[PDB]
Symmetry: C6
Subunit: 194 residues, 6 copies
């Protein structure tokens, strides 16, 4: 998609953020947004086209793909990116507001300190939450075979998924990127406190 | 699509708007435009391609998809974005006109105050209206099965929709974003009055 | 498509135009160009792919789609945009030429006044003309069923169109946008005269 | 495609050219490049996909499409644009070279006059030539039916073309644009001579 | 594809190059890169999709397309562009290095002269080489029929190619462009020597 | 995909890097990123669409493509580019941090020297590693035939790959580019030490 607006906002965040925060933003842009655009979106292009079920029942493939993949992985990662980014926008807005107020009348202390720490907190929580949701929804291994018993499918039908190994690889890659982001938030807290 | 022109106009609106207004515009750009471009448009890519009806009647799938989905959701959201944005453009134009007039001769009071409040009002009305239209047209749950009795379909035919669960998720996501926009307009009114 | 060049020219037109003219250009960019790019072009993507005729005759679907839709709607709107825009480019060029001449030697009167009024006139005429052509070619309701008797089709065949309801909606939307443009040209004339 | 580089060069040409030349370049950008990108390329998207021949012979559709359409129209127009543009680049380069030489040492006369006139000449010749080639290759009406007798086709087979009416419309549109370009070159010559 | 980076580098090369070199770069950008992007890539879009073999043997079309077209033409031209461009980048880098060194301490002679001449030489060699490779691999006429005897094909099968005439036209066009580039390099050498 | 952000970061790296480093970055941008975008991604577009297995077993093609190509080549190259780039970003960040610190108070020595050398080291290791992984996973020749015995396939089935020769060519091209990158890192080390 088009991430230019968010790109500008997060560059401005880089202008006003800790070094570890800059590392976090660079990770976000290179290892998550870029990887989705260049690589992952082409793996999931034929997710439903190349999803094959051994049946002659109309509508069984559709409902079985819907049950196998309620939300697609790529979409889930998109939402994860947006949500983990939002706190940074909040902090950047607080900063610009204080700057405008100073200008009206006539560098991390007071409200900025607290707000930044809270930003860190929320980023961490959201990240952990998406990780856990991904685990409980799919785990971290996409098996080639999916057995479906949803109406209109007669008895249990066997269905086969496109590119399970490649998808598995990218699932783990993005999970590792998320864990790196968590480590970076922890390091930022430590740096602040000491 | 290409939202760059609107992007520039709404950035200019950010230059001249309340803090809560800036939050509203950031929500608009990140949670609605971006989500449509990156995520939702790929969910609805195969809306009619993967729409399957259990019949051998030529033309039944077409008329049954037309009856099930008169306007697509993504298109409806596009129109919603445009319409909720228009008032902001009107207010921005009023502002630039007053600036040009001052320049000819030789900061929210008088006409700007009223016009801004009215902008808020219209944004709210339009938002609520689209929400209600969405509800009365589709509700907020897209069932996998759609039973169609429209000519040329013989008797009632069963038809099956692509990605009902994912579409349901995104419907609710966008509804929640709209409700957040409403809360923001209310907060802006309150801030003005007090 | 790519409207950037025209975008720049019409922004320059905004630099030199009446307030109502600025409103007209904003309408052009937001409600016509943007709507086509984001929404309408995806409705008409499968116009011929999902056009189904109940026959086993080779070539009947092609000739029946050609007879049903001689020019596609989206293409017609593209041409409408270009043509209604041209006068504005003519006026902008007259303006830049006078500016260059002043520069050589060493704000709406004389030739600029007349030329601007004529621009208005032409914009109006073209708009009305496209509206009427659209009406006489298609009307403003796209029926799902189209009965075709063109060779090689044997006797009369029934053919079915993709997304008739959505297309009908967008037809009316664009017609209303055109009528708004007409009202704006009328208002601009009135403002000039008084 | 991507016409940005050529766009920049021809904008520079506008910086150094007659008023009628500026009109010519605006015509080139709006009525030929833009129309191809936004409209014509979508008419010819399914030129071979929706080309249907009434036969069961493998390879007959391919050779019959190749014989019906040796070069596609859109490609022919692309080449026409490039070739009619080249002279303008030559003149612009002559100009920049003279400017650089003046700079080394320490507004249409001499070499610039001749070179510009010759540019006009070549533009005219190329235009007329492409027009005539288009006529002799296709004429200006694309008939729906094409009868093909090329091996491997057995006896004569009937083949049917996609969107003949729409293609016919756009053929005539582009021909009229080319004739307007010719009129503009003639007017430029007249302006120079008088 | 995206040629913007290379575009910037070669514009910088234009800043520091002979007039004939500027002509060469303009040829490169307009007649080779642009033609590929706008025109040729759409001719070769369905190279394998519309490649039809008269057989019922699974896998024969794949191996016969692979034997007929080991490397596609468009890809070959892409590589040709890259390779003929590289020397220019080398010369530009030599230039910028000398400029930086002058800056540290505190216009074609010495090392720059030799390096530029060598650039010319390499460009010529590479060009000639690609031309000859194209000839020995395909010649300059793409016949519609290709007879294939590669396993798993039983005996010899007849296979038919998409758009042979159009491809033939573009092959010759690009060959002529390459010969023009050669003439330009020769002219540049002559200009230097005299 | 979209490499603009990385492009900016690596341009900044060029601002602060050795000449051989600049050559390395130019190689990265021209011979790896550009080649993937313009050429390789179109070779691997139909990797699974045109993958044909001689069987009537549902799901055998999917599992046999997954076993033949666990990760696609293009995706592997994408990851290779990202990883070999990361060290350069680390070094650039170290540099900008030292610059900011100098600014607070009031050119390759100390920490910058070590960090740069380590960057070189890591780039080399990663490169070699990806090379070896590519070899052990696929080798450097993609055979047309792949024999598959994975469930649900009955006994051993023959499967055929799209464009094996072209893919083989590009595999070797990218391997040679990687070896050139290795030579450049070695040359940079030598230049530093002497
Ligand atoms: C503010 C934070 C709010 C958090 C709210 C959490 C709400 C949790 C509701 C718990 C209801 C559980 C009941 C249930 O769900 O019924 C079981 C059903 C799965 O059925 P199954 O066991 O057969 O396996 C499924 C196999 N299949 C994947 C092929 C289908 O559904 C599942 O378990 C899938 C559950 C997926 C949960 C996704 C949570 C996303 C959290 C995002 C947080 C973002 C923070 C900003
Ligand atoms: C902003 C924070 C967002 C947090 C989002 C958390 C989303 C958790 C979704 C849980 C879905 C369970 C679905 C299920 O029912 O499938 C498991 C069953 O069998 C079982 O495992 C039964 C036990 C299930 C234990 C689930 C523990 C969830 C703890 C979440 C902690 C999040 C911390 C931020
Ligand atoms: C300035 C504001 C003007 C507002 C004008 C509102 C006009 C309301 C006209 C009321 C006519 C009702 C009669 C009717 O419509 O016949 C019923 C028919 C649905 O048939 P059904 O009951 O079988 O279920 C349908 C199930 N199916 C979805 C699968 C097809 O159609 C429906 O109800 C669908 C109705 C959808 C209404 C959409 C309203 C959009 C408002 C946008 C506001 C924007 C403000 C800027
Ligand atoms: C600028 C403002 C735009 C507002 C747009 C409002 C659009 C309302 C569309 C209503 C379509 C009804 C379709 C229908 O007939 O299907 C329901 C039936 O059965 C029933 O429910 C019969 C009772 C239906 C009650 C509908 C109440 C609509 C109230 C709209 C309030 C909007 C405030 C802004
Ligand atoms: C400078 C201005 C010049 C204006 C020139 C106007 C020329 C008018 C020529 C009049 C000839 C009428 C004879 C005729 O056309 O035979 C009837 C035939 C339709 O047959 P049908 O009755 O069975 O229904 C058709 C149903 N079907 C749509 C499914 C096919 O064709 C039609 O009526 C369709 C006619 C469509 C007219 C489109 C006019 C566009 C104007 C654009 C103006 C732009 C200004 C800048
Ligand atoms: C720059 C100005 C451009 C104007 C473009 C106007 C295009 C009009 C196309 C008319 C096509 C008629 C096709 C037809 O024959 O189908 C109707 C029959 O049956 C009938 O209706 C027979 C009576 C038809 C009356 C048509 C009146 C057209 C008035 C156009 C006025 C335009 C003012 C600008
Ligand atoms: C520097 C200027 C050089 C100009 C060189 C002109 C060379 C002319 C060669 C004359 C040879 C004629 C013999 C011939 O060609 O055999 C006839 C054959 C058509 O067979 P057919 O009669 O059955 O109808 C064809 C029906 N079908 C279209 C469905 C296939 O081919 C045709 O006539 C098609 C001929 C198409 C000519 C295209 C000329 C393009 C000029 C571009 C100028 C650009 C200037 C910068
Ligand atoms: C830079 C200038 C480029 C000019 C390009 C001109 C291209 C002409 C192509 C002619 C193809 C003829 C194909 C043919 O053989 O099909 C017609 C036969 O039956 C006949 O018509 C036999 C008589 C054919 C007369 C053709 C006259 C061509 C005059 C071209 C003048 C161009 C002036 C610039
Ligand atoms: C820049 C200067 C503008 C030039 C505009 C050129 C317009 C050319 C119109 C050509 C119509 C050809 C119809 C045709 O040869 O087909 C043949 C078919 C039998 O007859 C039919 O089926 C006829 C069915 C009805 C066709 C109605 C087409 C109206 C298109 C209006 C477009 C206006 C754009 C300005
Ligand atoms: C630094 C410069 C290094 C240059 C190295 C040149 C190496 C030449 C190796 C010579 C081996 C010849 C043996 C051979 O190849 O066996 C014959 C076989 C073709 O079989 P066939 O006769 O049946 O016809 C083929 C018909 N079919 C196209 C449908 C398949 O293959 C062919 O001849 C096709 C040969 C294609 C050669 C392409 C050379 C590209 C040069 C690029 C230079 C770039 C400079 C920067
Ligand atoms: C940087 C320089 C790159 C140069 C790249 C040259 C590539 C030459 C490829 C030759 C492939 C031959 C394939 C073949 O075996 O098919 C022809 C056989 O039957 C025959 O023709 C047997 C005689 C073949 C003579 C081939 C002469 C090649 C001369 C290349 C000169 C390049 C100068 C730069
Ligand atoms: C920090 C560095 C960590 C490096 C960790 C290396 C871990 C190595 C694990 C070794 C396990 C070997 C067991 C195994 O794998 O079972 C054999 C199985 C292949 O079965 P097969 O023999 O039948 O042939 C396969 C033919 N087929 C391609 C059509 C499927 O799998 C294979 O061998 C394929 C193995 C592919 C290895 C890819 C390594 C990528 C390294 C990237 C380094 C990036 C540095 C930043
Ligand atoms: C950051 C560094 C990343 C390094 C990544 C290295 C990845 C190596 C993957 C090895 C996969 C083996 C799969 C296999 O089992 O298939 C071969 C079997 O049969 C055999 O060959 C058995 C002997 C296999 C010897 C493999 C030697 C690997 C040496 C890697 C050195 C990397 C240096 C950086």
């Amino acid at each position: 998609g088009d991430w230019s607006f968010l790109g500008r906002l997060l560059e401005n965040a880089q202008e006003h953020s800790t070094v570890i925060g800059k590392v976090w933003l660079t990770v976000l842009f290179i290892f998550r947004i870029l990887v989705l655009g260049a690589a992952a979106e082409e793996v999931w292009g034929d997710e439903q086209s190349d999803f094959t079920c051994n049946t002659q029942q109309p509508g069984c493939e559709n409902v079985c793909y819907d049950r196998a993949f309620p939300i697609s992985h790529v979409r889930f990662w998109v939402l994860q990116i947006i949500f983990v980014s939002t706190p940074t926008l909040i902090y950047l807005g607080h900063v610009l507001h204080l700057v405008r107020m100073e200008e009206k009348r006539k560098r991390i202390a007071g409200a900025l300190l607290r707000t930044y720490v809270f930003n860190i907190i929320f980023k961490t929580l959201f990240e952990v939450g998406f990780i856990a949701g991904q685990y409980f929804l799919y785990g971290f291994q996409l098996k080639p075979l999916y057995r479906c018993d949803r109406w209109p499918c007669p008895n249990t039908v066997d269905c086969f998924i496109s590119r399970p190994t490649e998808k598995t690889i990218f699932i783990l890659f993005m999970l590792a990127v998320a864990c790196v982001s968590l480590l970076l938030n922890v390091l930022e807290i430590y740096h602040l406190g000491w």
